[PDB]
Amino acid sequence: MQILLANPRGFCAGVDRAISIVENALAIYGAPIYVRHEVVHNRYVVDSLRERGAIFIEQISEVPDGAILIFSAHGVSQAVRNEAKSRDLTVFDATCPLVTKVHMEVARASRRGEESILIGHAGHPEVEGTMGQYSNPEGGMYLVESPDDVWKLTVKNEEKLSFMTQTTLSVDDTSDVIDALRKRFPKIVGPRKDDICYATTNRQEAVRALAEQAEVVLVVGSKNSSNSNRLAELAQRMGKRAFLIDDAKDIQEEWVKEVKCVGVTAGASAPDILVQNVVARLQQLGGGEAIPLEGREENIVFEVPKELR
Ligand SMILES: C/C(=C\COP(=O)(O)OP(=O)(O)O)CO
Ligand code: SF4
């Protein structure tokens, strides 16, 4: 059995920054360090940080006065931010810069009383934080997840309308949604394409190349990782069996028995060690040396704030 590795795969600039923020805060201030939501959606990372004294909470009420609070890489709403500011908390923000970029545009439309539409998945923390940048009752903030949602949406003033997107969406499905938005609201304004980040676009392009060779694709990532699910989904739609897994122990022999080519990739929040362990398991199951596919070289890095270096 041949083992192929997608490239790029694994950690993106925002996830590496956000994890370092929490690690550095624990070294500087000691336990406990409060973190609003899993810093990144990865069980291995989260479990480890708990171990070292990080405490993960959903609501600011859970945090004692005098505490240090870190906002997750997915971002938070202005309401949450202000609730944290009204309290006597020391706050560090691990929101990824590429999510903050979107937030700034939503706040601008809110200040103008002009409506905005967000393409994304209901209930996800990044969608809660981005929708949570809009607070003007004169305008409006609407969420659409599909073309059918666009077909049913009515707004107050489609002459002054703009859109934004979640950073981890399917590139292909978002394209369909935007096509619909432009047909329904011909004066709608947005970015040149969408707010899907470089890491999401690159991992999806890489898994596409991987799936065209591999019969089976294993995506290292947790169940609640949006971007990771998009990678398994993409391979599955190409007609390949694809499994989202947290670690090598999740691999069932049936998935790769008699398979000549198995591909491995990892979501933006999954540490490289998990991929190494998955490769080791596939080798014990008959696989040879892991072969990295050629890919788009990534070079962006986001530094931790100086106060945590
Ligand atoms: C922070 C972030 C992505 C990094 O991976 P995560 O798996 O942590 O988050 P997501 O894909 O949104 O479920 C959203 O920009
Ligand atoms: S997936 Fe993109 S936007 Fe999200 S943390 Fe990573 S680099 Fe930032």
Q: What is the CATH number of the domain that holds 155?
A: 3.40.1010.20
Residues 213 and 184 in one domain: no
197 lines ligand 2 (CB under 6 A): yes
Which of the following is catalytic: 23, 114, 115, 126? 126
Asked if residues 3 and 291 have their Cβ atoms less than 8 Å apart, the reply is: yes
Domain boundary among the residues 172, 196, 220 is at 196
Domain boundary among the residues 196, 222, 249 is at 196
Distance 236 CA to ligand 1 centre (A): 21
Residues 5 and 25 in one domain: no
Residues 201 and 291 in one domain: yes
Query: Which among 200, 206, 203, 145 has a CA at the least distance from the CA of 177?
Result: 145
What resolution in Å is listed for this PDB structure?
1.6
82 marked among binding-site residues: no
Residues 203 and 285 in one domain: yes
Question: In terms of residue numbers, what domain contains 179?
Answer: 97-196
Residues in CB range of 59: below 8 A, 6 or more apart: none
Residues 186 and 261 in one domain: no
The one-character DSSP state at 189 is B
Residues 232 and 275 in one domain: yes
Asked if residues 52 and 31 have their Cβ atoms less than 8 Å apart, the reply is: yes
CA 256 – CA 242 distance, rounded (Å) = 11
How far CA 7 is from CA of 11, 263, 278, 296, in Å, comes to 11, 11, 16, 7
Q: What domain count does the chain have?
A: 3
Q: How was this structure determined?
A: X-ray
Residues 88 and 101 in one domain: no
